[PDB]
Design an enzyme around this catalytic site. Structure first.
Site, short mmCIF file in Angstrom:
data_model
loop_
_atom_site.label_atom_id
_atom_site.label_comp_id
_atom_site.label_asym_id
_atom_site.label_seq_id
_atom_site.Cartn_x
_atom_site.Cartn_y
_atom_site.Cartn_z
N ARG A 63 122.48 9.17 -13.82
CA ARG A 63 123.70 9.56 -13.10
C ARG A 63 124.93 8.77 -13.55
O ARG A 63 125.98 9.35 -13.81
CB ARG A 63 123.60 9.41 -11.57
CG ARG A 63 122.24 9.26 -10.91
CD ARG A 63 122.38 9.03 -9.40
NE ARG A 63 123.19 10.08 -8.73
CZ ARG A 63 124.50 10.04 -8.49
NH1 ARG A 63 125.25 9.00 -8.83
NH2 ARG A 63 125.09 11.08 -7.89
N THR A 64 124.78 7.44 -13.64
CA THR A 64 125.90 6.56 -13.97
C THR A 64 126.20 6.59 -15.47
O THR A 64 127.36 6.70 -15.85
CB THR A 64 125.73 5.11 -13.45
OG1 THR A 64 124.36 4.74 -13.53
CG2 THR A 64 126.18 4.99 -11.98
N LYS A 90 107.87 -5.21 -26.15
CA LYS A 90 108.75 -5.79 -27.18
C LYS A 90 109.23 -7.21 -26.81
O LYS A 90 108.76 -8.20 -27.39
CB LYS A 90 109.94 -4.85 -27.46
CG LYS A 90 109.91 -4.16 -28.82
CD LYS A 90 110.26 -5.14 -29.94
CE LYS A 90 110.30 -4.47 -31.29
NZ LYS A 90 109.03 -3.78 -31.64
N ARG A 126 124.25 -2.26 -17.59
CA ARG A 126 123.62 -2.34 -16.26
C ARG A 126 122.39 -3.16 -16.39
O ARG A 126 121.50 -2.80 -17.15
CB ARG A 126 123.22 -0.96 -15.83
CG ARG A 126 122.91 -0.77 -14.36
CD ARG A 126 122.93 0.73 -14.19
NE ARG A 126 122.51 1.23 -12.90
CZ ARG A 126 123.29 1.46 -11.85
NH1 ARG A 126 124.57 1.14 -11.85
NH2 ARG A 126 122.73 1.97 -10.77
N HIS A 152 129.95 -3.90 -8.91
CA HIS A 152 130.09 -2.62 -9.54
C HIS A 152 131.61 -2.32 -9.56
O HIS A 152 132.11 -1.56 -8.74
CB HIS A 152 129.32 -1.59 -8.74
CG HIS A 152 128.93 -0.37 -9.52
ND1 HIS A 152 129.61 0.08 -10.64
CD2 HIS A 152 127.94 0.53 -9.31
CE1 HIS A 152 129.05 1.18 -11.08
NE2 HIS A 152 128.04 1.48 -10.29
#
Lengths: 295, 301, 312
Positions: free
Chosen positions: C65-66, C88, C109, C137
């Site tokens: 979404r973001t 990894k 993020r 945010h």
């Protein structure tokens, strides 16, 4: 200008073996002209309305991104095809809609399979343990652009040279097309440069005259004499801040990435750490390859 | 070029969810638009039509070929694509996409998900497969294929072969063809358990009656079916049902015919048939990009 | 269109990490720039302002979404997007350096609060913080301010409630800092179960500015009729098994629904960063004061305004 290298027009890019010295020189210089423009804020609409499609059977965000970013910076477009359906069925699906495929696969002979049915260029982003030629070419561009030239250099290839598909392609590209003085094959004895890689190379090794001085681990003769240190993973081999003392002033370290212990973060700020600049050269070499093939 | 590529006007603004909504006039208008675009793209031209519009896929189901066909359509019209990967409801997912998009391509496993999405969406939705329901764009490109390989759709004999019960392709193709064309015959080749449902076939009875269309079922791919058919349109079964098309059975077929497949394919379509000039199923993908180009432009012009 | 769409000069070359980095003038610059963008896009016009420029994601959480809101803003500016998936134990720092090689801006993020400070330290290109653990945010706070400004006409003089998991809500951490430092908020209601109340390390740093502007701060654990009848803005969030997340009574006390909305004034708005669970009933959706879906359109224009200004 950014004229394309005519000899790649429409060609598939499978092996380092297919690249002549005039080919390399041209791509190295197209890539630089391009860098000059992108760094100057210029926008390139060379490949608008043309589509690249990645076909990555094995994950690698760095290789993927570099090809994408390169295509985008030439005005082109990217359509991902996430990957039992046969390889050929996929190849024919991509040929439906794309202008160039970019395939990374864990079997070596998957490449030759695909080329048999492909109608558009396939660029080999790497196959099992065989080759990875856009890397070999980007590595050469790094050396040309960092050290001034590739002729007459001494070069070390650290890490498991058996499975490392970067070192094979590079070893071929360099020997076949340049005047390389020495080549330190540094690794464990079991994980060394295969016989099949070294055997077709034997003509050029003689008539050019090319020392293949092997070693079990990082000797001081290596550190002293090497203009380029090209290390790789394996998952007295480590390059660290301590050992870098012994390097000359005009030399570079390289690493295609990713890395583990074999190249310490203690070397990062050293101006001869070219391993990060190497990725940007990568974008520019791939812009030169993409434009040349699709021109 | 608004000159040489004029969009179909009936489609402007509209969501594309079913075969039932297309007139015969629309279908040929799309087919002609598709071909005009194929000539322009093959000449090496760059179309600029949807610069600044955004296409947003919403796939709740793995389907790389459909996605990439749609992404490829949009891009070659000069549009852009925003990848959205599927607690959070469907409607909310739609309203989110709707906040930055020009068209949604949805693909859901449930059949009614499309009605849910349509209930809240402000921008157009193209249904890229809704459960066991429909695949309207597939049927439109298949029809483009039939037309471009055979030169006419009226008068053909067609075999729908494979899982007819769950095949959203065959539901859409049957609806699209029967409704808007003079179909001679339709072989419904499948086991009784995977037969063409009566609620797809009920709404068509009237059109079946009027146009005089033979509706013939067989549990296996018989030799009647091979000899009479102008299009063998085959699909997978996702032990021993006998419906496979190999080069040997192709000795039974006419000279002017095509084999078709939406893809992917399993053992019902041997690689022996591929080389055959009547193997259309690879050309089918390319025709599909152009129909999807036609449709997207018509929807968004 | 550089007299048409002037970038906010103070923002040129900057990483966007915290709401505290913005002045009142900056915010108004971005609002006016975002409105000019809506004028352009809604007119059907196309922009080339970031043609040739690349955005990539460095997402260690997952929130399509973001990353999509960001992609959409970049693409409408004429720019481009290269995806980059993280799986990894290759170092964070190497991931950054690898993105730096071909990008023009990063969108980060990370679930660790202080991985942003690591990235900044090595980045040669602007990072946009799209969420750091329980930190901030910032872009979110800016688009929320744009929403309030567009829908009610002004920000000075508002009563606003911040509802839900405030301890972990990063949208509200940033919104609170931004609002209190640059506007004359009449009153903030902090509505949350006690265990999930607005942290002290957010509030204490704002006490001078509160004292000085006379902002009234009321905790509650519930949407009392006081809250509903006084609030011009109802900004709720989602709850993320410890006692309060588990409690039905904690849920019902903070829930907004058609019923409770009968207590609310004629001229206010309900806001939510999305996604939502049951705390915001779908029965509120038809209410013209439900601004949570419009919030998403303002957001696109606010990200356009921010990216154009960072990358001009």
């Amino acid at each position: 200008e950014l004229p394309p290298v005519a000899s790649l027009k429409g060609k598939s890019i499978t092996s380092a073996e297919q690249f002549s010295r005039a080919d390399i020189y041209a791509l190295i210089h197209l890539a630089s002209a391009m860098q000059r423009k992108i760094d100057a804020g210029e926008v390139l609409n060379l490949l608008q309305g043309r589509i690249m499609t990645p076909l990555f059977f094995e994950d690698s965000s760095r290789t993927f991104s570099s090809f994408c970013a390169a295509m985008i910076r030439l005005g082109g477009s990217v359509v991902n095809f996430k990957v039992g359906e046969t390889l050929a069925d996929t190849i024919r699906t991509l040929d439906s809609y794309s202008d160039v495929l970019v395939m990374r696969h864990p079997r070596q002979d998957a490449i030759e399979e695909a080329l048999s049915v492909a109608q558009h260029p396939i660029l080999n982003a790497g196959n099992g343990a065989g080759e990875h030629p856009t890397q070999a070419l980007l590595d050469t561009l790094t050396i040309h652009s960092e050290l001034g030239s590739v002729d007459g250099i001494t070069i070390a290839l650290i890490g498991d040279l058996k499975m490392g598909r970067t070192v094979h392609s590079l070893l071929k590209l360099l020997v076949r097309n340049f005047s390389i003085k020495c080549v330190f094959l540094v690794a464990p004895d079991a994980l060394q440069m295969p016989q099949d890689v070294l055997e077709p190379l034997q003509h050029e090794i003689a008539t050019k005259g090319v020392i293949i001085h092997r070693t079990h681990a990082l000797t001081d003769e290596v550190m002293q004499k090497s203009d380029v240190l090209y290390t790789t993973r394996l998952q007295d081999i480590t390059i660290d801040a301590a050992r870098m003392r012994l390097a000359k002033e005009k030399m570079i370290v390289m690493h295609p990435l990713p890395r583990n212990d074999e190249l310490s973060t203690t070397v990062d700020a050293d101006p001869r750490a070219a391993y990060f600049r190497q990725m940007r050269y990568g974008m520019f070499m791939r812009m030169a390859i993409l434009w040349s093939v699709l021109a």
